[PDB]
Design a protein around this ligand. Structure first.
Ligand code: FES
Length: 106
């Protein structure tokens, strides 16, 4: 699947995350999450704070309270589709996901 994380000013990245990969995985593979915010899928960090375009949040796995927690933890432009790529799985239908990165990615 196609993946394009955006920045706060709009600058984005572009991976190729397939069905089963989390944009966080691929992103941390193309050098997207160059930072050190990995909770081993344990949902205990806040550096993976991001925003998946509304066309890939309800298409990809719309995680529950867990993702709404660490996400609710970030201190940036939270959204209805706010997300921490750690669980946004890229599928073959969501080929072309647009992710949004905030300026407050604590
Ligand atoms: S990788 Fe830790 S919650 Fe996103």
């Amino acid at each position: 699947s196609k993946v394009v994380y955006v920045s706060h000013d709009g600058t984005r990245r572009e991976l190729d995350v397939a069905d089963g990969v989390s944009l966080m995985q691929a992103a941390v593979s193309n050098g997207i999450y160059d930072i050190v915010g990995d909770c081993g899928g344990s949902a205990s960090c806040a550096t993976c704070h991001v925003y998946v375009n509304e066309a890939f949040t309800d298409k990809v796995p719309a995680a529950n309270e867990r993702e709404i927690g660490m996400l609710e933890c970030v201190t940036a432009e939270l959204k209805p589709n706010s997300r921490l790529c750690c669980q946004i799985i890229m599928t073959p239908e969501l080929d072309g996901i647009v992710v949004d990165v905030p300026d407050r990615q604590w």
